[PDB]
């Protein structure tokens, strides 16, 4: 069944080939052949957003 | 894919990083490897364009949404909604990632209709919602938005596209 | 002199009065005669946004 | 104001949180109390709209600044402006809070020409970026937009609009 904790997965898209680093460029796991190249994926909890939600109620009737 | 399966059968926040071997092999295991990591970045990238996009879309055809008693009426229920669209844009975009529909349609939509129906949250702001964001997804995959632009090598995309508007499409048949 | 450590106050403004809350709504100081209303900041260090110069780059010449 | 102080000079990450009696009196000893709260929060709950589209018109403006070698080529230098802009921005954001430029003139500005010039920052740019906040955190505090709006009782904001302007013309003087 669907699950109720809304959860979903994050996915983050890595293209570091220019060069700049930092500290999560490195050690989280190999590059072997796909230099500066990453997919992160986690099950992480969606929030509420309530200055979108006051933004949009407010905004919405401008495209 | 036993990474991805590992850290969303957890679902306790643990990352999968994919990157060298294990990340050639998933280019080469889903088609179009490299081109389909350009398309989720296309979708993710712009999750909050997305679906503050869409759900304003929604209730500036139907005003009546944010009227007292509405489906989004109060901070409370419209942040619940745009909650609820960035789930599943992002059930969608893993489902872009992984080149099957299967942790979407089990873990997001299985059910679905059924708790929004028992709780009222109307099937046709709904599926609008879900059209608008379908729209969007569509234009960012192409890099062809007015004004967000992504810069990847020129070619097609097309068929990626079409992938993701069928995974929205299931969105759509799941909450009717 | 100015600091080097790319750190900047971080102002949240809280209007609660709607009644919607969460755990952060209670317990982080008194509320008394000022239901539902909190200035918070703090010294937060600004990062890079990778994306977001990604996006400039590409998109800076449509308004 | 010993609470902002203590927290700005520690800067460890430890919040202060003014509610309450608190509260009432830090909008008690500034002018136009309440309204400097959404003048504030005008700001704040923009300020990724305000950077992205002050950095975005300075080089649609001047590419020059992008083209090769130019002060935001390549992804690193076009992220260290945003954040030059976001830190600026904050800095602004924290005097119309306070009602006062010293944090923002002595932690901020104080020896900054000094160091974009011995790293070759373009001074032009920069006051244009710095302007167009300006002009766009000017619209957001009078709610006049064409876009995002902010819901607030009807009224006159133009004083606390005049000061964050002047905020800004400090930022603007010690950038030369
Ligand atoms: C974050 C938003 C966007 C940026 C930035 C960008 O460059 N494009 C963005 C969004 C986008 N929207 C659409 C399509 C639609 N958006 C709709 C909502 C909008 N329309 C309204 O009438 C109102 C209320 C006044 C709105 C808030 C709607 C209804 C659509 C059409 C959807 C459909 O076809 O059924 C797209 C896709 C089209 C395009 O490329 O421009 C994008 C990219
Ligand atoms: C996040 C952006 C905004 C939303 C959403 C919204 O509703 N308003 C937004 C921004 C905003 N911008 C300005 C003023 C200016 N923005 C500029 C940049 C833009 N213009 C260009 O030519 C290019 C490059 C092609 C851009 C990226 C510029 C140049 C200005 C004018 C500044 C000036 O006066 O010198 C405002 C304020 C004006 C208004 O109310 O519309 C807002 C609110
Ligand atoms: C309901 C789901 C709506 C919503 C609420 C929401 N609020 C926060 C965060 C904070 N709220 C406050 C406000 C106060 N804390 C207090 O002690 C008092 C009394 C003096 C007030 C008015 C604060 C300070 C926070 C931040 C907490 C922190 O800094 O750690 C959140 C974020 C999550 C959380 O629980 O902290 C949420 C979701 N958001 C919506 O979108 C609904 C409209
Ligand atoms: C449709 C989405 C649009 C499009 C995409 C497109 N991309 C390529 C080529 C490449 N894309 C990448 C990108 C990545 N690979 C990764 O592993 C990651 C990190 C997870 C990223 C971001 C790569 C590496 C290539 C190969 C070339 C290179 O080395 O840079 C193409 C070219 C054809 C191909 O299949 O290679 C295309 C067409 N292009 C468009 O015009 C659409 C808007
Ligand atoms: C340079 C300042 C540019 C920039 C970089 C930047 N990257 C991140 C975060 C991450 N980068 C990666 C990429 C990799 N990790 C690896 O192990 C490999 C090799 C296989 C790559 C390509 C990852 C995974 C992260 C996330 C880290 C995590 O999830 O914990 C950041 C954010 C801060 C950080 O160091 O984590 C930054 C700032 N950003 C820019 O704007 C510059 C263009
Ligand atoms: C200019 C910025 C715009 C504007 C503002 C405006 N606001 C009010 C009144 C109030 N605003 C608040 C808001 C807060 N007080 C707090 O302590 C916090 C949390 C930190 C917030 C968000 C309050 C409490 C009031 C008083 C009224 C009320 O109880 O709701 C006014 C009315 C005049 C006044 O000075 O009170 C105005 C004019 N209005 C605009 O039209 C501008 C775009
Ligand atoms: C937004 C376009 C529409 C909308 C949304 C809305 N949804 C709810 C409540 C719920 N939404 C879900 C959905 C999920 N929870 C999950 O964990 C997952 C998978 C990971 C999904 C898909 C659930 C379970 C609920 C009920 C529980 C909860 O609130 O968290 C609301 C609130 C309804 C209410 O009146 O209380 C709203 C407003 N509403 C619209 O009008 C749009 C069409
Ligand atoms: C953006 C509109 C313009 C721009 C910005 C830019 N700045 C730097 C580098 C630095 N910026 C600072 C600024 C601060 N650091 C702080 O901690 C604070 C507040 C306390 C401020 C105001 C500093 C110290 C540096 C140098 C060290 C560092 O990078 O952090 C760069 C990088 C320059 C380079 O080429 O190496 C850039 C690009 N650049 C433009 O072209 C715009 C005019």
């Given at each position: 069944?669907?699950?109720?904790?809304?959860?979903?997965?994050?996915?983050?898209?890595?293209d570091?080939?220019?060069?700049?680093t930092?500290?999560?460029?490195?050690?989280?796991?190999?590059?072997?052949?796909?230099?500066?190249?990453?997919?992160?994926?986690?099950?992480?909890?969606?929030?509420?957003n309530?200055?979108?939600?006051?933004?949009?109620?407010?905004?919405?009737?401008?495209? | 894919?036993?990474?991805?399966?590992?850290v969303?059968?957890?679902?306790?926040?643990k990352?999968?990083?994919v990157?060298?071997?294990?990340?050639?092999?998933?280019?080469?295991?889903?088609?179009?490897?490299?081109?389909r990591?350009?398309?989720?970045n296309?979708?993710?990238?712009?999750?909050?364009?997305?679906?503050?996009?869409?759900?304003?879309?929604?209730?500036?055809?139907?005003?009546?949404?944010?009227?007292?008693?509405?489906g989004?009426?109060?901070?409370?229920?419209?942040?619940?909604?745009?909650?609820?669209?960035?789930?599943?844009?992002?059930?969608?975009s893993?489902?872009?990632?992984?080149?099957?529909?299967?942790?979407?349609?089990?873990?997001?939509?299985?059910?679905?209709?059924?708790?929004?129906?028992?709780?009222?949250?109307?099937?046709?702001?709904?599926?609008?919602?879900?059209?608008?964001?379908?729209?969007?997804?569509?234009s960012?995959?192409?890099?062809?938005?007015?004004?967000?632009?992504?810069?990847?090598?020129?070619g097609?995309?097309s068929?990626?596209?079409?992938?993701?508007?069928?995974?929205?499409?299931?969105?759509?048949?799941?909450?009717?």
């Amino acid at each position: 069944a669907m699950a109720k904790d809304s959860k979903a997965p994050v996915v983050e898209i890595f293209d570091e080939r220019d060069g700049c680093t930092s500290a999560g460029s490195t050690g989280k796991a190999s590059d072997a052949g796909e230099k500066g190249l990453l997919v992160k994926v986690s099950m992480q909890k969606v929030g509420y957003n309530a200055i979108m939600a006051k933004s949009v109620a407010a905004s919405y009737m401008n495209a | 894919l036993d990474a991805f399966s590992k850290v969303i059968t957890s679902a306790d926040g643990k990352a999968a990083y994919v990157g060298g071997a294990d990340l050639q092999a998933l280019k080469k295991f889903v088609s179009d490897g490299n081109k389909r990591m350009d398309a989720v970045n296309a979708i993710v990238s712009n999750a909050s364009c997305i679906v503050s996009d869409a759900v304003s879309g929604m209730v500036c055809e139907n005003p009546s949404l944010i009227a007292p008693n509405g489906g989004v009426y109060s901070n409370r229920k419209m942040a619940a909604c745009l909650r609820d669209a960035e789930i599943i844009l992002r059930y969608v975009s893993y489902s872009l990632l992984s080149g099957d529909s299967s942790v979407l349609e089990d873990r997001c939509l299985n059910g679905l209709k059924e708790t929004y129906s028992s709780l009222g949250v109307p099937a046709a702001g709904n599926a609008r919602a879900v059209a608008i964001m379908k729209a969007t997804v569509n234009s960012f995959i192409n890099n062809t938005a007015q004004q967000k632009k992504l810069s990847v090598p020129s070619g097609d995309c097309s068929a990626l596209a079409s992938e993701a508007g069928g995974y929205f499409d299931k969105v759509t048949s799941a909450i009717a």
